[PDB]
Design a protein around this motif. Sequence first.
Motif, short mmCIF file in Angstrom:
data_model
loop_
_atom_site.label_atom_id
_atom_site.label_comp_id
_atom_site.label_asym_id
_atom_site.label_seq_id
_atom_site.Cartn_x
_atom_site.Cartn_y
_atom_site.Cartn_z
N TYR B 85 0.82 -1.21 0.00
CA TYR B 85 0.00 0.00 0.00
C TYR B 85 0.86 1.26 0.00
O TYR B 85 0.64 2.17 -0.81
N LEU B 89 0.84 3.74 -3.27
CA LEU B 89 0.36 5.12 -3.31
C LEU B 89 1.40 6.04 -3.94
O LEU B 89 1.08 6.87 -4.80
N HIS B 105 -6.63 12.01 -7.00
CA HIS B 105 -7.43 11.67 -5.83
C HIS B 105 -8.37 10.51 -6.11
O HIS B 105 -8.50 9.60 -5.29
N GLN B 109 -8.31 6.86 -4.31
CA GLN B 109 -9.49 6.36 -3.62
C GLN B 109 -9.92 5.01 -4.18
O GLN B 109 -10.25 4.09 -3.41
N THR B 112 -7.46 2.34 -2.97
CA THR B 112 -7.66 2.01 -1.56
C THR B 112 -8.92 1.18 -1.37
O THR B 112 -8.92 0.21 -0.59
N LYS B 113 -10.00 1.53 -2.06
CA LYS B 113 -11.24 0.76 -1.94
C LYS B 113 -11.04 -0.67 -2.44
O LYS B 113 -11.51 -1.63 -1.81
N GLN B 116 -8.99 -2.61 0.17
CA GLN B 116 -9.78 -2.98 1.34
C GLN B 116 -10.93 -3.92 0.99
O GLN B 116 -11.53 -4.50 1.90
N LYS D 2 -3.60 4.99 8.82
CA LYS D 2 -2.86 5.11 7.57
C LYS D 2 -3.71 4.85 6.33
O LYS D 2 -3.29 5.23 5.24
N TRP D 3 -4.87 4.22 6.48
CA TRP D 3 -5.72 3.93 5.34
C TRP D 3 -6.25 5.23 4.74
O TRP D 3 -6.87 6.04 5.44
N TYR D 4 -5.99 5.44 3.45
CA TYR D 4 -6.53 6.61 2.77
C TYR D 4 -8.06 6.51 2.75
O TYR D 4 -8.61 5.42 2.57
N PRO D 5 -8.78 7.63 2.93
CA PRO D 5 -10.25 7.55 2.90
C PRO D 5 -10.78 7.03 1.58
O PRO D 5 -10.62 7.68 0.54
N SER D 6 -11.41 5.86 1.60
CA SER D 6 -12.00 5.29 0.39
C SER D 6 -13.25 6.03 -0.05
O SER D 6 -13.76 5.76 -1.14
N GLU D 7 -13.77 6.93 0.78
CA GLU D 7 -14.91 7.76 0.41
C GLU D 7 -14.75 9.10 1.10
O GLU D 7 -14.71 9.17 2.33
N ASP D 8 -14.66 10.17 0.30
CA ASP D 8 -14.29 11.48 0.83
C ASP D 8 -15.42 12.11 1.62
O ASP D 8 -16.05 13.07 1.17
N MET E 82 -17.91 2.47 -5.17
CA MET E 82 -17.43 3.75 -4.66
C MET E 82 -18.50 4.53 -3.91
O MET E 82 -18.23 5.65 -3.46
#
Lengths: 127, 173, 267, 82, 123, 52
Positions: B85, B89, B105, B109, B112-113, B116, D2-8, E82
């Motif tokens: 990760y 990034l 961005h 995102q 990351t989604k 996870q 540390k996890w980047y926001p998967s939904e802003d 998303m």
Amino acid sequence: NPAKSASARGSYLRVSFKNTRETAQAINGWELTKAQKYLEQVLDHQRAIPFRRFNRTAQGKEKARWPAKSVKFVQGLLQNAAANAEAKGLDATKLYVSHIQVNQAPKESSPSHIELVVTEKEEAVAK
Amino acid sequence: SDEIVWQVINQSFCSHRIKAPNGQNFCRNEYNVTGLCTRQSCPLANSKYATVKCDNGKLYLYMKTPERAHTPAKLWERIKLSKNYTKALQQIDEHLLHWSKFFRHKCKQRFTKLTQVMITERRLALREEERHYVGVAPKVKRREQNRERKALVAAKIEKAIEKELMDRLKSGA
Amino acid sequence: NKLKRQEIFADIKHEKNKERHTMRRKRAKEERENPELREQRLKENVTQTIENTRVYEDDLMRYFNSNSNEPPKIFLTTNVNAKKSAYEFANILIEILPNVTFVKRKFGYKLKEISDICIKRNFTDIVIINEDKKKVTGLTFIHLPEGPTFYFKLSSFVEHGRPTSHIPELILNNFQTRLGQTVGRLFQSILPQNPDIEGRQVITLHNQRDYIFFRRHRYVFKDNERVGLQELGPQFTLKLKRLQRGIKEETEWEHKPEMDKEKKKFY
Amino acid sequence: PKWYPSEDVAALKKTRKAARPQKLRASLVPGTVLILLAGRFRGKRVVYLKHLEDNTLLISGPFKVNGVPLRRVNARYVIATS
Amino acid sequence: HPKIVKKHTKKFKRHHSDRYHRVAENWRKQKGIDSVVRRRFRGNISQPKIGYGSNKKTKFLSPSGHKTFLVANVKDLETLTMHTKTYAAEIAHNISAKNRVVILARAKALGIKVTNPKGRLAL
Amino acid sequence: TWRKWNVKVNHNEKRYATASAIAATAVASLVLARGHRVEKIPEIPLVVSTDL
RNA sequence: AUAUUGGCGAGAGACCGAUAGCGAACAGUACAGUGAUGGAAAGAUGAAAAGAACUUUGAAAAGAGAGUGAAAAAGUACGUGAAAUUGUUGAAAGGAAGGGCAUUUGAUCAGACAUGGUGUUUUGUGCCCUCUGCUCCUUGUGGGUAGGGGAUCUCGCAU
RNA sequence: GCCCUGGGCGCUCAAGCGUGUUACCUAUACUCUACCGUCAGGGUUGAUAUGAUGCCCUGACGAGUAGGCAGGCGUGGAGGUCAGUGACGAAGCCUAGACCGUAAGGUCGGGUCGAACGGCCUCUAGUGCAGAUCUUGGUGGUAGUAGCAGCGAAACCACACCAAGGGGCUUGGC
């Protein structure tokens, strides 16, 4: 419970719907033998069938009439139900009419469908 | 051009748009970071685009440039994302150097989604769920309901019980 | 033409019924004077019921079932995320099963872990009820040694007398088939094996085609050499399923939806 | 962490609400006898010992006299005697 | 999320929708000038109007806080990856149980909330 | 039977529409939005030898 | 070259769908009128009749068993069965009822196979380290795929 | 000046009359706040951490017959798209089940049903019913009544005892 009940049905009969309904109501819940005896007495004019919905005598104390035509079909259906129960090997003494219904048949005269069910009373219960 | 394509897909029946009851136009295209068919998000309306997609366990950073618009067979290039990760990034940021902040961005995102989303492995590891989802057809349901009633009627359990009891206590007491 | 077809058959049925009634009356009248002819006619006319048209080890019992030498401890639990209906059914399970211990599902102890813990505690069988809606839909029984198990579907669960503390007598019916007697043996080894006839409590299992009816009644005899019975509360029907023959391995008879077309063989 | 926001999800604004110590009413003084209006020991008479940092009052029956142990209590559910 | 304040929870019903069987419950404005409902006299059924407008920030959001989104297949389900928090996958009534299990598996894998799970399924 | 069935269209407008439709085929994104699986075409517009 | 709602024979409809379409999808038939004339209602069972063998109550209607059938919640009154209306069971309430604002009581329905996330410590693996290769474009801050050697290893996973 | 002569229940240092001083209840009336829309203005990019037909800030306004303007719901059919849905059940129907929207309506939970139907941009019209002493078909009270133990209608049908105020809402009673 089908194992403890018997059914008899008559469809497309030409008896008056109102008189048949009154007769069925006057006989609903009675014991099979007692119901048959009451119908036989009605045929003898010793007792009258009350007309509580579709309508003065001492026989009405128990506004009453003697619908012999309807009573004949009612007793025939009761005899058919008794024969069905005997075929099923049920106890006729414990049999009582638990359900009886009259339904308007297709049209002239007003025919109707009559169906009744007899069930065995529960008894002989102990620890 | 992009403006003509953008306006035609917007007001002239884009084929991959979905209209939600809330009033949001979605986008089921596989190459979009976001499932919304807005400007700067639909890959067809923008010459330059970036997205993350995976076929095997590996994740890939998919991007396109005007160098390949004339050749759709080679429209999208991909690079292994270095599924670590922290490394992934920074690799994405370096690859998207000087790109619009929106694209960077959205790509981060999406990555990351997708990373996870590996919860599937967690559930797969925590398998042996015995519920065993089973579908019941209406025809199958009808068979059991009516035939069970017929079997109950024909069985006459009370008579059988009485006969067994009579035969049992005849020489059992 | 609809009118022509309806009219033609309407008159035909009336004539057929008239002929049938007249023939029946004449046959009865002539048989009254000739009783033997009625017997011959009855012998020559079989009702052809579905039952009449059916289309055609001590070591095993001890090894895969409980015996009187040691009462069986039965482990009772429920599938994860259970609700009130499951516990209500478990109450009846306690009321009917001999020696039951109820343990909340821990949600993560694998079936192997549960079996190992039960072996550590010397348990004899595992019974687990599963639910989807607020209703019982299936029941399972597994034996600890060698892992013989059976899965049963649950339907028509209905809650009138109050059972006494006496152990009901066990009676099994219609388990002639080899597969059927296996479920019969399972029931005979899972339910109490020591009758206490005093108190007139009876528990009965009655299979007809594929469903087994479980009910409780009080039985009282009379001088007429007949016994009357009264419903003792719950109604119960079960359907065997998946016949695993192991904890989860080597299924032997698992039912398939494609069956039941033959209409017979009453597995 | 540390996890980047998967939904802003939008971040909250800088709230201008600084925490302040509770300003207890002057009637509440240490050593005062208190009457509990609710709870397990409702209606019991209690002694006010100390004020706690969580806006509660450290109190004691004392335990020996009436069985009420050292417990936290809210000033709003207490009547302060003289 | 902001509180879901329902300005009018009661379903609006057409005038005399219960007095006569030939009048459907679907709301229809009275056209007669003499109609009391048109003049909104006191005690009459409430008339729908611009006032009952729900706020945008909570419009179309179910009590669980997730917006409903009809899903026909796995491809449609994957579009909510998303927007899992804001949107929830709803299986259509015409989806056969065969595909329902597959759709539910993918929704669980992606963590998408299902509004009507287990429909037509048995355990 | 004498209801209007055909619509008169200016020839110049008809040619304009045909030219616009022909031009639209040159954009892969526009063609992709039309629902055609042209994601793998080597080149757009697709030119092939006359031997076809 | 021009007309064509009659006749024979063909190709079609952004047409209608058993209260529509020709009055007639099964009719210029039944039927009414001394008469010239008017003029209807009616489609679908079920794959196939496999159309309920047989027992049993009824002068007769049709019932109860029994079985055929995917289903009889398809039994020739047959593709599906809503209202107006009628009878039974249950709940409620009683010279009226109907609707709106707010709520109690009674009955009853929903109410997560959510069971996680973070840093640390053993052990086994790979896309991980190293050596040796093959393969696609173009040429590029690449992709795909192999054979030998280990737990410097948390780069990911499983414990 | 007053007292007799010319809404009910009720009241007399009034709970009546005139005047004087304070406490309080409310209407959609007015102040502020919470939300829907209309208008007016303004911000917006070497592109927006959501369709420049997008995302926003500010203030006021919101009654209504005829009439005018604007934005949408639903149906028969057609062009296009969902390499759509569907015997592991499409349409319809039922449902003291739930969700969404100010609503036309859409969606999902459960039962019968069986084989076609739908998400979206446009085109098309024999496209939406509460009545027209409206048409077809069906069913009730009248009524088991008039009538000819049994058979058996027709007319009519918005709805069902009175005192006062007000054509059959206010205050009360056989």
